[PDB]
């Protein structure tokens, strides 16, 4: 029926159908369109107190709870989707990953290199698509597939 990971869902507010991807946590009203050896992705990471390393270039000691990290992520997604902010600007300003200095770009990678939930989301995105919140041991990510 639908591309990998996508399912139909029912909006509680409006009652209209939408589409949710249980691999990427993406959600959208539009029916999703239409696997490579490698993909290229950028990401925005928000770490929390249960991250494998609760430290980053932004903050020597990261103390926010995982729930607080998810709220931050949800807010960044909202601003990206509304166009108030662009992904690259938010990643450069707020990603707890050292890749923030590269607008969140991680370059290209294969399966078997990244943390599995991050890998699976990256490979389930199509070029140009953005994930919803993706949880790994590093924290919570927003992933943008660029190639
Ligand atoms: C406007 C919008 C937002 C998210 C996905 C799509 C699409 O896949 O067509 N379109
Ligand atoms: C750049 C930086 C600073 C402090 C911790 C970390 C990390 O462990 O990810 N990275
Ligand atoms: C990521 C998240 C979101 C909401 C609650 C919690 C928690 O109870 O730890 N965690
Ligand atoms: C994964 C990545 C991308 C760009 C810069 C860095 C770093 O300076 O550590 N790391």
From Swiss-Prot:
Pfam family, one: WW
Subcellular location: Nucleus; Nucleus speckle; Cytoplasm
Primary localization class, coarse: nucleus
SUPFAM superfamilies (alphabetical): FKBP-like, WW domain
PROSITE patterns in alphabetical order: PPIC_PPIASE_1, PPIC_PPIASE_2, WW_DOMAIN_1, WW_DOMAIN_2
Entry EC no(s): 5.2.1.8
Reaction catalysis annotation: [protein]-peptidylproline (omega=180) = [protein]-peptidylproline (omega=0)
Domain WW residues, every copy: 1-34
PTM section of the record: Phosphorylation at Ser-55 by DAPK1 results in inhibition of its catalytic activity, nuclear localization, and its ability to induce centrosome amplification, chromosome instability and cell transformation. Ser-55 is dephosphorylated upon IL33-stimulation of dendritic cells.
An annotated GO BP: Rho protein signal transduction
GO molecular function: beta-catenin binding; cis-trans isomerase activity; cytoskeletal motor activity; GTPase activating protein binding; mitogen-activated protein kinase kinase binding; peptidyl-prolyl cis-trans isomerase activity; phosphoprotein binding; phosphoserine residue binding
Domain notes: The WW domain is required for the interaction with STIL and KIF20B.
This protein's name: Peptidyl-prolyl cis-trans isomerase NIMA-interacting 1
Species for this entry: Homo sapiens
Name of the coding gene: PIN1
